[PDB]
C-alpha cells in the first residue's frame, strides 16, 4: 500500500484569557507519532509512538525548535488575519493548517498538499501541481500575491518532494513493526428484536488498522446502502479502530441479510451470514 505523513496545526486566539493556544499533531498513516501543546508543561515536541522514541537528542531539539517557529508564525498570523478582515481585535479566532506528503507502494513521492483555514473555512491551499495556490477570498489573495512574489510554493515544493518523502520512509523502516502492519478486523454480528414484525441486525468491526474499512449490507446478495446505518469509524484508543453498520429487518428474514467487510488486512472480503 501507499503511505502518508501529515502534520496538523491549530492555533486559537484567546483575548483576555492569555496567549494563543497552539497544538500540533504528527501522523504517519493513521498512527500519531508526535505532538506539541503550548498549554502543556514539557514545552517539547513529545513522542507518542514507540518507534519515534528511537530518535536522538539532535532530533528532538530540532523538532522542538521548528514547532515553536511554527507556533510563533501563527501568533503573528492571527494578528495579520484579523487585520485583513478588519475584525474587532477582541474575539477568539482559529487558524488551522495541515500539510504533508504521500508516497506510493514503491515509497516514492506520490502527492503533496498544504492547507490553511481561518475560522473553519478554507483560506489558502497549495494546488495539486505544487506550483500555484487556490485562494478562498480577497484576504487569501493578498497572501497569495505575497507568497507568489517571494517564491514560497517553490520552497514548499522542495520540502514536500524531498525531506517529507525521505523522512516518511525513515519512519516507515524504523517503525516497520507497527506502521507497516495490518490488524485484520475482529468481526461478529448481533441480533435485536424491536417489535413483533421487526428486528435490528448489527455488524461489528473491532481491532482493525488502518482506519479504512467498508461494511455494507446485502439483501439476497444485492446492496442496501439505502436502508442501513453506518457509524463514523472511531478510535478504540489503543492505536486500533472500530465500526458498526446496522440494518432493521422484518421478522423471519434474518437469513437473507449478509454483512460484507472489506479491509486491507483481510485476504478476501468477509461475508458474515445469519446461519442458525
Amino acid at each position: 500500500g501507499s503511505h502518508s505523513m501529515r502534520y496538523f496545526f491549530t492555533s486559537v486566539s484567546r483575548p483576555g484569557r492569555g496567549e494563543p493556544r497552539f497544538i500540533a499533531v504528527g501522523y504517519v498513516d493513521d498512527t500519531q507519532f508526535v505532538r506539541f501543546d503550548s498549554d502543556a508543561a514539557s514545552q517539547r515536541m513529545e513522542p507518542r509512538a514507540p518507534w519515534i522514541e528511537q530518535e536522538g537528542p539532535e532530533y528532538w531539539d530540532g523538532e522542538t525548535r521548528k514547532v515553536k517557529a511554527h507556533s510563533q508564525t501563527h501568533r503573528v498570523d492571527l494578528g495579520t488575519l484579523r487585520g485583513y478582515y478588519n475584525q474587532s481585535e477582541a474575539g477568539s479566532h482559529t487558524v488551522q493548517r495541515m500539510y504533508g506528503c504521500d508516497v506510493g507502494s514503491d515509497w516514492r513521492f506520490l502527492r503533496g498538499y498544504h492547507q490553511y483555514a481561518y475560522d473553519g473555512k478554507d483560506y489558502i491551499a497549495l494546488k495539486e501541481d505544487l506550483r500555484s495556490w487556490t485562494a478562498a477570498d480577497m484576504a487569501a489573495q493578498t497572501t497569495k500575491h505575497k507568497w507568489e512574489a517571494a517564491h514560497v510554493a517553490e520552497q514548499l515544493r522542495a520540502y514536500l518532494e524531498g525531506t517529507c518523502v525521505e523522512w516518511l520512509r525513515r519512519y516507515l523502516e524504523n517503525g516497520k513493526e507497527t506502521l507497516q502492519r495490518t490488524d485484520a478486523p475482529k468481526t461478529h454480528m448481533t441480533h435485536h428484536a424491536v417489535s413483533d414484525h421487526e428486528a435490528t441486525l448489527r455488524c461489528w468491526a473491532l481491532s482493525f488498522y488502518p482506519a479504512e474499512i467498508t461494511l455494507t449490507w446485502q439483501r439476497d446478495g444485492e446492496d442496501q446502502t439505502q436502508d442501513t446505518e453506518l457509524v463514523e469509524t472511531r478510535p478504540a484508543g489503543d492505536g486500533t479502530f472500530q465500526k458498526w453498520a446496522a440494518v432493521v429487518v422484518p421478522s423471519g428474514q434474518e437469513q437473507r441479510y449478509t454483512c460484507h467487510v472489506q479491509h486491507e488486512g483481510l485476504p478476501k472480503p468477509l461475508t458474515l451470514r445469519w446461519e442458525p
Binding site: 502534520y7 523538532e63 521548528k66 514547532v67 517557529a69 511554527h70 508564525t73 503573528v76 498570523d77 495579520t80 488575519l81 487558524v95 493548517r97 500539510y99 490553511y116 483560506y123 489558502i124 497572501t143 507568497w147 517571494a150 514560497v152 520552497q155 514548499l156 520540502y159 525531506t163 517529507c164 523522512w167
Partner: peptide, 9 residues
Amino acid sequence: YLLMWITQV
C-alpha cells in the same frame, strides 16, 4: 519532520 519554517500569511 517539520518544515524548517513557515512564512507569515
